[PDB]
DNA sequence: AACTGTGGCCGTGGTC
DNA sequence: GACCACGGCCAC
């Protein structure tokens, strides 16, 4: 299969180089034939012989056109032929194509911006990936000697670990008597004894987690203080780091550096991302943390260094577990949008999306669009409308069935032949018209993005059935992300029409999938109250709970079995609505906010305080056991003596004030905040004494006793001291817990005033 | 992380 | 007090 692919220049020419393993082989393979180019349609066929004189300069050099070939193209599926404009180098390209587009006979030029390693896999039809290859995996971690007020790397790395198949080990430089640690002189011959071990191994993926920002960037530092050329490169180089966004990468070249934390962070909810937190949701098994506090200590003082090595060996080897599992999924997406493993395990959605359409509109003869320049981009800034969401039925309901359309607004986008080649196009036998905004459709040959949907829903069916059928409780769970990223992928086909910068923006497209969706969600549920006596609890864009008032569990499953038979026949195409479940019980709050049971006692909440990040833990604990209390136990007195409980003891001071700290993420730059909340005005005091406050930086604060403004009264959780700080009880009663149980207890009749003191 | 999209709750600190 | 805009994070 191939790994990846990149160029390298040589004597001027570039040289694709194909990273492979076949038959347990490394290999690399270089192309130096595939030339760059871009398109150009002109006003007359004889004005190629004054475009091929064009010249441009970059760095001294002349740029010139190397040759032309004309070609049959579509835009937009209309027929037209353009001119391929070769080149001898890639940096051509950006240096010319103003001066060709400017030209009085050229109408307009396309895809021009390219990379040329991608292009290279596009045209040839390569897909990395691909076949039966077994590829080696090893994992990797450090530990560090850390003290405040250090600069970056200032301090030495102190251990090495490892992880694979055949076990984990740790390098280090101090004498530790366990019989997985290897003991070397220095710092410097622990960094060559694991160069030493990758080049043994020969490992075709590295697995880190969080490499990109911290492991990677460490050795260099090392490295470039202690002399190390630290080649773990198949071709010999060092690791490439690159900035990408916010935030680097690193390659490193012949093999795939696979860092765990991008893949993680977008496929799993979890408050927080540390390895611990990610290795007990994925496997149910505990992992200790050790902090930077004590790993310096116990070096300094030569004391309890068994716990540091023990703690960095379990570090490998659950980085190695976790990547053992996470990397074919990935791998599999990398199949589905023809690219590097390494790239889209890092790359946003929008370049996922536009990947895979370069790729089926090149195998289509379609020309991709332009991306818009500043002006268009400005153009293209106007809202539509969304999703009908229906005011609830607000309280405790009972014998809850939840129904729910299968991908619904890719199935309208199938169904419906939605797509800018398709809107508005003249001529055609047969139309659909969207409700409300009127668009119209035509259906007489498949639109090209709608004709690519159905096999992402094929695929992703297939897995949600295995799922369903899985015994093993991890395998479920990963089947489960594999079919959810297909679900955020298809969905993200939609929002791309409506994405500003997309090459196949057409909001016209965007604001009738919205309005069809709509059309369907209200015709629904007028169908399943009005012909079978239903009542629609909750209902958002495109699924509802609803029972038939009086009636026991048996009958609500039957005859929603029977709405479902009849609704399907008369849905066109691709639309289904779906049995999603039973719930024995449900309390609705507010739209987006309710909280259900299912018979096997499992209660799932969605968009409760219980879920929030930024709410403090003593509100979402109090809350979640008011819940349990309520829609487990029936017991409403139960749940007030919980309240009561938290009340007091806030009262009291008895509540750890580690629960009481409130997480909030920094968005932008502190000077562009207009509105100045807690967490800024805490954000603004730390810049203040120079720390390095960035757009993602999350502030943990905690509330002191004090009357005005929380703000200033907030101060970080990294500044509380017991003795000192005594912390706002009053704001955590009236500000946190009630607030949070008080929207569920009124519909019992109690006050904030029955839950006090 | 997100810049694939819109809809929505709710705390906060302002206006009057 | 009533009201509003901002900003975060969440449900689709
Ligand atoms: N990321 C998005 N980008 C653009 N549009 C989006 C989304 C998005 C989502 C999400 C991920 N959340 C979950 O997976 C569950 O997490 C809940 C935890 O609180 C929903 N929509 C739109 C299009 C979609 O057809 C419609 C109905 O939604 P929804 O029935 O869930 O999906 P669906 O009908 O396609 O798929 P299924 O029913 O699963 O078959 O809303
Ligand atoms: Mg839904
Ligand atoms: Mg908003
Ligand atoms: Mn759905």
């Known amino acids: 299969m191939i790994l990846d692919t990149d160029y390298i220049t040589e004597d001027g020419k570039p040289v694709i180089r194909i990273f492979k393993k076949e038959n347990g082989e490394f290999k690399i393979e270089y192309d130096r034939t595939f030339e760059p180019y871009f398109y150009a349609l002109l006003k007359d066929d004889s004005a190629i012989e004054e475009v091929k004189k064009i010249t441009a300069e970059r760095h001294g050099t002349v740029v010139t056109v190397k040759r032309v070939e004309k070609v049959q193209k579509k835009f937009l599926g ?38 040329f390693a991608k292009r290279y896999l596009i045209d040839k039809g390569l897909v990395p990936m691909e076949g039966d290859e077994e590829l080696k995996m090893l994992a990797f971690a450090i530990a560090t000697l850390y003290h405040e007020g250090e600069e970056f790397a200032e301090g030495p790395i102190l251990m090495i670990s490892y992880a694979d198949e055949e076990g984990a080990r740790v390098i280090t430089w101090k004498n530790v008597d366990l019989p997985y640690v290897d003991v070397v002189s220095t710092e410097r011959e622990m960094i060559k004894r694991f160069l030493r071990v990758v080049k043994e191994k020969d490992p075709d993926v590295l697995i880190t987690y969080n490499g990109d920002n911290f492991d990677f960037a460490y050795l260099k530092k090392r490295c470039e203080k202690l002399g190390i050329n630290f080649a773990l490169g198949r071709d010999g180089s060092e690791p490439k780091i690159q900035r990408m966004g916010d935030r680097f990468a690193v390659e490193v070249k012949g093999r ?16 927080t991302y540390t390895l611990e937190a990610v290795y007990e949701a994925v496997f149910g098994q505990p992992k200790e943390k050790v902090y930077a506090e004590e790993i310096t200590t116990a070096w300094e003082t030569g004391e309890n260094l068994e716990r540091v090595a023990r703690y960095s060996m379990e570090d490998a080897k659950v980085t190695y577990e976790l990547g053992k599992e996470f990397l074919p999924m990935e791998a599999q997406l990398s199949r589905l949008i ?25 195998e289509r003869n379609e020309l991709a669009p332009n991306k818009p320049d500043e002006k268009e981009l400005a153009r293209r800034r106007q809202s539509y409308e969304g999703g009908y969401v229906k005011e609830p039925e607000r309280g405790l309901w009972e014998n809850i069935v939840y129904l729910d359309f299968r991908s619904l607004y890719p199935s309208i986008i199938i169904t419906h032949n939605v797509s800018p080649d398709t809107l508005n196009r003249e001529g055609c036998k047969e139309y659909d018209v969207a409700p409300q905004v009127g668009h119209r459709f035509c259906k007489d040959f498949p639109g090209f993005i709608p004709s690519l949907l159905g096999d992402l829903l094929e695929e992703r069916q297939k897995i949600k059935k295995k799922m369903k059928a899985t015994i093993d409780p991890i395998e479920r769970k990963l089947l489960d992300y594999r079919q959810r990223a297909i679900k955020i992928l298809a969905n993200s086909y939609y929002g791309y029409y409506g994405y ?20 369907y969600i209200t015709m629904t549920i007028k169908e399943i109250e009005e ?26 499953k039957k005859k929603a079995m029977e709405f479902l038979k009849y609704i399907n026949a008369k849905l066109p195409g691709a639309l289904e609505l779906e049995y999603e479940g039973f719930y024995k019980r449900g309390f609705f709050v507010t739209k987006k906010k309710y909280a259900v049971i299912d018979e096997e006692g499992k209660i799932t909440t969605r968009g409760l305080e219980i879920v929030r990040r930024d709410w403090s833990e003593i509100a979402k604990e109090t809350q979640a056991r008011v819940l349990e209390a309520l829609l487990k136990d029936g017991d409403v007195e139960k749940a007030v003596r919980i309240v009561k409980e ?45 720390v390095k406050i960035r757009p993602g930086t999350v502030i943990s604060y905690i509330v002191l006793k004090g009357s005005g403004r929380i703000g200033d009264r907030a101060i970080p959780f990294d500044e509380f001291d017991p003795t000192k700080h005594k912390y706002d009880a009053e704001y955590y009663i009236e500000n946190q817990v009630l607030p949070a149980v008080e929207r569920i207890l009124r519909a019992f009749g109690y006050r904030k005033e029955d839950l006090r003191y």
């Open 78 to 115: 209309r027929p037209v032929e353009v001119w391929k404009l070769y080149f001898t180098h890639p940096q051509d390209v950006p240096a010319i194509r103003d001066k060709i587009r400017e030209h009085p006979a050229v109408i307009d030029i396309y895809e021009y911006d390219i990379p």
């Open 256 to 271: 795939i550096h696979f860092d765990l934390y991008p893949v993680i962070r977008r496929t799993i909810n979890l408050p």
């Open 338 to 362: 023809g690219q590097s493993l390494w790239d889209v395990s890092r790359s946003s959605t929008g370049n996922l999306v536009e990947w895979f359409l370069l790729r089926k509109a090149y």
């Open 500 to 519: 500003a910068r997309a090459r196949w923006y057409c909001k016209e497209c965007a604001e009738s999938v919205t309005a069809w969706g709509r059309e």
């Open 531 to 556: 012909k079978y006596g239903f009542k629609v609890i909750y209902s958002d864009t495109d699924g509802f709970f609803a029972t038939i008032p009086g009636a026991d569990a048996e009958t609500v």
């Open 646 to 690: 938290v009340t007091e003891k806030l009262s009291k001071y008895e509540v750890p004030p580690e629960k009481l700290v409130i997480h909030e993420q920094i968005t932008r730059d502190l000077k562009d905040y207009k509105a100045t909340g807690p967490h800024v005005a805490v954000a603004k005091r730390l810049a203040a004494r120079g």
